[PDB]
Design a protein around this ligand. Structure first.
Ligand SMILES: *CC(=O)NCCNC(=O)CCNC(=O)[C@H](O)C(C)(C)COP(*)(=O)O
Ligand SMILES: *CC(=O)NCCNC(=O)CCNC(=O)[C@H](O)C(C)(C)COP(*)(=O)O
Lengths: 61, 490, 490, 61
């Protein structure tokens, strides 16, 4: 539940169910600044380049 | 060297596609309505951000012109029978003519802000979306920017710099400051009509929209087996020069441009059956254009030359209007028919049509002899362009990125099949085109049947793998169904 | 086909001419000062409206960029030995790359507002001033707009569309909204310095100015007897394509562009003695540029390749900066000397200069073997351009439109004669150039003497007809002395 | 005195002595709108195209 939430708000979506763990981070509209912001936000609760898929990062938490 | 056109896309008031534009022009209707006087694009604050992999925050501050041009390019690529995924890391050039930044004007009254308000990226983003290695530039010559971009793309194709080119323009009226400036300049028609070559001419009306076309060399198009919509023979760009006034056009410059472009194209008089006028409906430009056309093409003709302008239907689109006119010519080169021109009751006394051997097309009549047409675009600064174009010499699978998108695509396919244009296409050709000329997305829906009725019924019912070896001639198919969501600054 | 350069003009911070620019570069000084951090053009609100026949009211609402480009074009035409009055009704093309509208931004917070706030007219007005019939367009590719315009002018000259071309760019920072947007984007150096290829690189500094050059085919230049400043061999424009980010540049695209441009130019490695870096001083672009240059030109060389950037002296001029760099290269191709590059103390750890076989020029040394140089301009959107240029293979009459202008012209001529460059020119050649290569205005002043001292003394004293048969080789002369008056909106 | 005055103000000049009766109206920066305005102002106290020089118009009054 740490990927559906805490990431849709960063992307600016309204509902957490609008994200799909099938496309790459770049395919979702992620740049260096957004990657840094996502890492900083997830740290409270280059790792994105190592695993460019939300599904892969989901299993880590 | 001739240039072959293999596809086109457009977005105009009351015309979201080439078929809609042809229906509007043939019916003799006008899309100029009241402000929700001018042509409008029925909401421009909607975009499919997920299709192009753009975050909603980025798309919110992005210029809607960029989104419109991206959608137009995708539609043109889909309608040309070329899979965009096969165009990656290729020498594909993009030439878009933009001369308006109303979105930046509204915004100036983030980090992707600067990025979303740059005029160059309007083309560059396409090179980012398609992964093309060809040149990408934005030209600004006024109201003839699109034709200049088309000429530049043709020259680049001739020189071998680019293999496939995308050429066109866009113009969206959003900020009221532009309208205030235009009204202050004193060029808007008080009644909001474009009386092209008419005695009631008192200005022009403003329109918005955009268009794009795909350009490739004739030899490569014939070698690749592509279907040719039209053949551009020659093009030329010049300037008015030492005119009486910076705004006043020059007749001699237009005459020289026409003479040189028709000498380069190799087409003599009595061979061109239609000329697309600039048609601003002004009291000065129209007589000059008529005199130039009569001196160049009017003379030495046994029959009057038919003329017309597309601004009488949708209005003046400024930097984009030019390519729109060319699109109209392309339609007139595909259906072999002419469409009427509105806002014409009596000849202009300043325009001696009898002496100039010109006549305004005001009825729908078949076109008979190959057919050659010319499109002219004159900028207010003094830049003039002319383009001469002649006529060209059972399971069903659909794909989409969303179940709602899949249902919309199935419904649109069923509607197109119910259309007579779809009826003229055999089911085998339709299936082969869907399997080959359409990209395979994530979500897939495959249907089976015996005849057209069964497949159409199944497609409506569900609306609410190497298939090449399984299966002809390539046929046009409806484009992608975009799921647009509101995106605006706040 | 090679292209011959016959003249140039520039306007840069602390450098109002090619001689001033060479003096600034040779002395190793930096024009980046505090805001009255960046380079500034010492008042841009002054214009000579009467010289170009422009009413003060019209010039008040006119973009200062248009005035600057007009003055630069006039200076370039004067320095090329061609009388502007002989260029009327000729096929002369104008290509100016502009990507900024800060004046419109300020004004938007009359009927001239239209013609004064339009980006296209920046070039079109020139076609109105010179009465040229060649194409006139404005290109927008980001920071490489000027190089793209130069390439387009060269292609038009090669295709025969234009006989003489004017190519360059301009960029003026006026509105504070642009500065705020740039600061928000996060690219401004905290200390306001451009550390090109330096370990202290932390961004770039902004500069303003403009430049223009005159382009003609080598065969026509040799036939016309013109003196050649440099010979452009080939040019190429491409796009990054499928980069990691829309902002991140691609190394492979730059390598392919360099390879294709050097294959078209016919110049193999170990023949180019200098390369003009883009030199933005960023932590990402600089290593990519260094790696690409080392992979393309660095390999197969017995000696390290000298590199440098002009942004270390005046700053980043954005869309104009490119042509400025080319101008610098032209200077390095005329004096046969190299100028030092500032803001370089230690090599960047991310840039292996030893492996890349590259070295930064940090001293003034003579250039020895013909000499070949390359100028690169990369657009932030993704457009990249590269230009390869090699070295080229007694009464005095003055005229002006005002007595004060005549006195200023006489004083400038006397000062130029006192300069060593004027001393290297014989009096007969100077008189012949003044009589032939300079246009005759309304007010005229003719002096006579025996030697240089007498003529110079008379010219200072007064500072406060077919002459062709009377008189050689054409020599450069100082340009016109503009009487500038304040013109600003209120 | 009807040309040095009543016309410099139209062009926007500060002093009436800055105008010269030697250049054409177009050379001074006159378009159709300014020509119409000048004719209307002079009427109180296409004629410009007939005599495109201020000196020629000076002798008419
Ligand atoms: C006008 C112009 O072309 N200027 C170029 C000056 N800027 C650069 O070269 C920036 C190159 N890009 C980067 O350094 C990174 O892409 C950014 C801008 C730091 C973004 O990194 P990340 O957030 O994607
Ligand atoms: C965007 C674009 O190119 N639009 C063309 C529409 N406008 C015109 O065609 C104006 C042509 N010029 C004129 O009608 C006259 O020059 C003016 C504008 C009435 C000025 O006349 P005078 O005051 O010099």
């Amino acid at each position: 539940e740490t990927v559906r939430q805490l990431t849709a708000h960063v992307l600016g979506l309204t509902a957490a169910a609008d994200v799909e763990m099938t496309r790459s981070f770049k395919d979702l509209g992620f740049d260096s600044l957004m990657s840094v912001e996502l890492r900083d936000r997830l740290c409270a609760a280059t790792l994105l380049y190592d695993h460019p898929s939300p599904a892969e990062t989901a299993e880590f938490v | 060297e001739p240039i072959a056109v293999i596809g086109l896309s457009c977005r105009l008031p009351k015309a979201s596609g080439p078929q809609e534009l042809w229906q509007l022009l043939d019916d003799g209707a006008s899309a100029v309505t009241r402000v929700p006087w001018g042509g409008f694009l029925d909401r421009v604050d909607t975009f499919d951000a997920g299709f192009f992999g753009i975050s909603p925050r980025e798309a919110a501050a992005m210029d809607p012109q960029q989104r419109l041009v991206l959608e137009l390019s995708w539609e043109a690529l889909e309608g040309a029978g070329l899979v965009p995924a096969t165009l990656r890391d290729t020498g594909l050039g993009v030439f878009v003519g933009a001369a308006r930044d109303d979105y930046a004007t509204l915004y100036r009254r983030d980090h992707h802000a600067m990025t979303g308000l740059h005029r160059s990226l309007i083309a560059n983003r396409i090179s980012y979306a398609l992964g093309a290695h060809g040149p990408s530039m934005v030209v600004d010559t006024g109201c003839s920017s699109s034709l200049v971009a088309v000429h530049l793309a043709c020259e680049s194709l001739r020189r071998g710099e680019s293999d496939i080119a995308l050429a066109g323009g866009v113009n969206l009226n959003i900020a009221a400051e532009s309208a205030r400036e235009t009204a202050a300049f004193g060029g808007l028609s008080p009644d909001g009509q474009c009386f092209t070559f008419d005695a009631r001419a008192n200005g022009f009306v403003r329109g918005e929209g955009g268009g794009l076309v795909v350009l490739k060399t004739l030899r490569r198009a014939l070698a690749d087996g592509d279907l040719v919509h039209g053949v551009i023979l020659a093009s030329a760009v010049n300037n008015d020069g030492p005119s009486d006034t910076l705004t006043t056009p020059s007749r001699r410059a237009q005459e020289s441009l026409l003479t040189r472009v028709y000498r380069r194209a190799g087409v003599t008089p009595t061979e061109v059956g239609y000329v697309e006028l600039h048609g601003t409906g002004t009291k000065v430009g129209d007589p000059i254009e008529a005199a130039a056309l009569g001196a160049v093409l009017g003379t030495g003709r046994d029959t009057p030359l038919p003329v017309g302008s597309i601004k009488t239907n949708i209005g003046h689109l400024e930097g984009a209007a030019g390519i729109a006119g060319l699109i109209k010519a392309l339609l007139q080169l595909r259906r072999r028919r002419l469409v009427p021109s509105l806002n014409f009751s009596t000849p202009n006394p300043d325009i001696p049509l009898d002496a100039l051997n010109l006549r305004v097309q005001q009825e729908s009549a078949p076109w008979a002899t190959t057919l050659v047409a010319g499109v002219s675009s004159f900028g207010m600064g003094g830049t003039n362009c002319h383009v001469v174009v002649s006529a060209a010499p059972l399971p069903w699978v659909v794909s989409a990125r969303s179940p709602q998108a899949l249902r919309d695509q199935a419904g649109r396919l069923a509607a197109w099949a119910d259309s007579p244009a779809g009826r003229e296409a055999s089911p085998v050709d339709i299936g082969w085109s869907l399997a080959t000329s359409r990209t395979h997305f994530e979500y897939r829906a495959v249907v089976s049947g015996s005849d057209r009725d069964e497949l159409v019924a199944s497609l409506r019912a569900l609306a609410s793998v190497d298939w090449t070896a399984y299966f002809a001639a390539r046929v046009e198919l409806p484009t992608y169904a975009f799921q647009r969501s509101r995106h605006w600054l706040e």
